[PDB]
Design a protein around this nucleic acid. Sequence first.
DNA 1: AAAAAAAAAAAAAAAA
RNA 2: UUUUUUUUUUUUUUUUUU
Lengths: 418, 473, 51
Amino acid sequence: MRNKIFISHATPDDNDFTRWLALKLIGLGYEVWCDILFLDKGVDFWSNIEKVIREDTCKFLLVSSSYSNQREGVLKELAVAAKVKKQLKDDKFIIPLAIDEQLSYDDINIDIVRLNAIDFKMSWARGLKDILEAFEKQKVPKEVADASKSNLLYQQIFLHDKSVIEKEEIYDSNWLSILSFPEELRFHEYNWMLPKRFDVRELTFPAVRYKNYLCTFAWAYDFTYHLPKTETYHKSKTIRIPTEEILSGSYDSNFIRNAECKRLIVQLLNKAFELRMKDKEVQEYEMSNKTAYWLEKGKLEKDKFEKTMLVGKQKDKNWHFAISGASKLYPFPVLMISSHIFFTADGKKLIDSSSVQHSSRRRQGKNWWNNTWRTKLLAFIKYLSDDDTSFYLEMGSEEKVFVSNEPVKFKGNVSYNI
Amino acid sequence: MKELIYIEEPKILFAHGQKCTDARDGLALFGPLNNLYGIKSGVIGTKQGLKIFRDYLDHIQKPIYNSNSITRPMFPGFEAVFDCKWESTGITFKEVTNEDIGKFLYNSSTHKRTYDLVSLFIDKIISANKNEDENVDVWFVIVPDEIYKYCRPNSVLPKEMVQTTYNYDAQFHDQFKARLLKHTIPTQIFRESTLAWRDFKNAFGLPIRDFSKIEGHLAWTISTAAFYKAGGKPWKLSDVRNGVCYLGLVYKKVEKSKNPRNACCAAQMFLDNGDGTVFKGEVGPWYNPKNGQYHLEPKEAKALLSQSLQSYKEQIGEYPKEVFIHAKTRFNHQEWDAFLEVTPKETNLVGVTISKTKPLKLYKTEGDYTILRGNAYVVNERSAFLWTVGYVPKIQTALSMEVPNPLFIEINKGEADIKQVLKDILSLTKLNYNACIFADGEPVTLRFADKIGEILTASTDIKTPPLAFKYYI
Amino acid sequence: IFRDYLDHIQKPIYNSNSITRPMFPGFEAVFDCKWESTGITFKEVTNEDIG
DNA sequence: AAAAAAAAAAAAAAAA
RNA sequence: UUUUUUUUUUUUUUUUUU
Ligand SMILES: Nc1ncnc2c1ncn2[C@@H]1O[C@H](COP(=O)(O)OP(=O)(O)OC[C@H]2O[C@H](O)[C@H](O)[C@@H]2O)[C@@H](O)[C@H]1O
């Protein structure tokens, strides 16, 4: 029977490509004949070529290049291939291969002008793959052989089975956009009304001391309880600035600089969000720089908001999901939310062993993919939400910022599938 | 609702002048660029260590099968992938007796025991290099695991097993590869656990470092590292532009001298006459005083940039037209002023900062898989988020394991095409010679620069360090 | 000239009198080792510098 | 003695 | 240290205010 694939080629030059292709095909379980690797030395080479082409060559492969177009031997064996093609009644017996970028399809030989040629010029992988389709679709015999190396290499050829596809996809970030701000950020001249050796962290509403002024989004007299002296403050001393101009960046002068007046907004938002966690009665764990907030066991109805479980158990260790918020304004007015996992011994007391907490977090997170982080983060956002679409962060009796409960959505022009 | 643009996956060059995006698959089928006719292997160690090395080498001569081939391709064998000969015959082996390695190890002072262990191996390596006729391409150093428990900082040697230099780093790897720079010996250290782990077992009875499914990539990265250290070129980039020199700067702390002194290190990557890619180090470490500056004084900046520029002229001849300087820390004005002075008129100096600290986490709407790597959100002409870490379809998994964090790229100085800047760092994420992975999360300039920084702060007596990466990685 | 000499010694070479000085049969023939003209690492030294 | 916005060195685990 | 990555810890620095 015919179970050999003959690779005609220009011997002086094209030996490298032909050797590579022959090795690949032999590895792929296909029997291969070529002068460089399978010709028997000290034998009538033309007679052997005639015998193999006429008798056992099931498929013919010609390596066509700038040399092989005018080589005599390839022309003779090509004519023999054409004759045996006429004998066999197989139009797919011969597949020429284009190797040279310089060999335009205009100047290729006529009998392979009539034939369609499988392209190898750009990549030697796509061309070999196309040989693969050509051989199974025409049912070229293939010995299974090792059946492990063969099919493993067959899969390794197609690097092609999973490529980028042009498809729209939406992405939900961990960012919450700030819908609105109070009209003006106020710079009160409290001066001696505010005690010098006092801490603004325990104050009811966020406020930062800059120079000799108190900076906040609250009304002037919202801090009467902690500052009783401020009952007689004059509101004409207020240094209101058009907050929207600061967001644009228009306002800049000796009193305040664009660089620091944006650092004075993110701190106020940070303190407001901290007070927001304190209002919601969530518990706190001290991280290296920030302080994350988690939910107790039993505080939620069966410890799961919406349809995702947020507090659970592994062995003795009770795991709690937590979120930390950070306010930045460079890309947009944004509160980014980062997710964290904490562990407790009885559901209420956080484990003091940092190594135990880190190892426990690793063991839990060993098997959480995207839909285990995203849904839980959104559920926590919904729990902190005051209405269907947003919640409010409060800095004053009447001034608040609305933070949307849905993450900033992006769009991807490329996607993929499992 | 914001648009993010995708940048094409880079393809890296292989034998026969053809290109491929994947590295392991590309060298698996296409072959390396240059021929290392044979690899002359030298091994130092004890008896129970050499046997495991020989067994592993015999294992990796034959193909090794992975559990899930879509995530991790088939390994055809060292001789199959690199067409080079490297067997168990011809191994120049040096003895390290168990009693001798025990005498120094059971020492109360961690620094003293570390220095003694480093000296014991290094003196033997130097002797083998100098007083023997055999030539060794690369020197594999294998060390036991009790050494691996008790030879780095914060390692408390157990009291029941204590039996009995401060100007050196107590990390064995850094000190070892640091003191060997004067002799230019390509070296690569093994843990015995990294070797045929099946002998090492835990309490539960399974091997502590069970690599049953990941033997393949173990062989992949060890073979690639050995090929690189012996002078071979595994792959090469294809989209490198002419006249572009990059440099990657990193700063490291030194504990030996009072104040960290903040040693700086750089790594170069540029094209050469023809198609040969020159990817060497830029090692003239310029120590930067003060505890937390990370901004480098003008004279050292001038020296570093010049030493980079003649490092281009001696190989290509003419002035670069565009330089794209990368670093982990931001650039302030005074160092850029010094840089500009050395920079010639036609040369376009670009100073780009790189950071992973930005908390952006894009969660796709549905699917137990992350965003696809290569996606880029452009904040503005100067700054962007580029997901160098993420999912790539070919490897069937994400390069990340949790939700990835994109890379923050800002053109701090210069003008630069931000799209082109993003089109170059993702290419630099492919040149990881130390590991046979699809891609790396950070550019190789800032990674090999980090490595050469970590290796040079171990020994303070280094003079004119080698600029070849084979002595470092 | 170095490349030419390496090419010569790649092939066998013959002395005038074989019984006195045996002919050299080829580098790979004698040492069973691969050492070709391809892959030489060259380091240029211009004539002006040595002048 | 704080703050935020930037810095590195180390340890633990699980993935390729 | 075959690697990679995500975290967890500290520590530090700058610019400003008292
Ligand atoms: N005793 C010999 N006589 C002739 N040629 C020989 C001999 N021994 C080896 N060769 C080599 O045989 C080669 C003759 O090839 P060519 O006619 O020049 O150019 P092509 O591209 O048309 O050859 C392509 C086919 O002819 C081949 O035979 C194969 O069968 C090819 O399939 C020379 O390299 C000789 O070095």
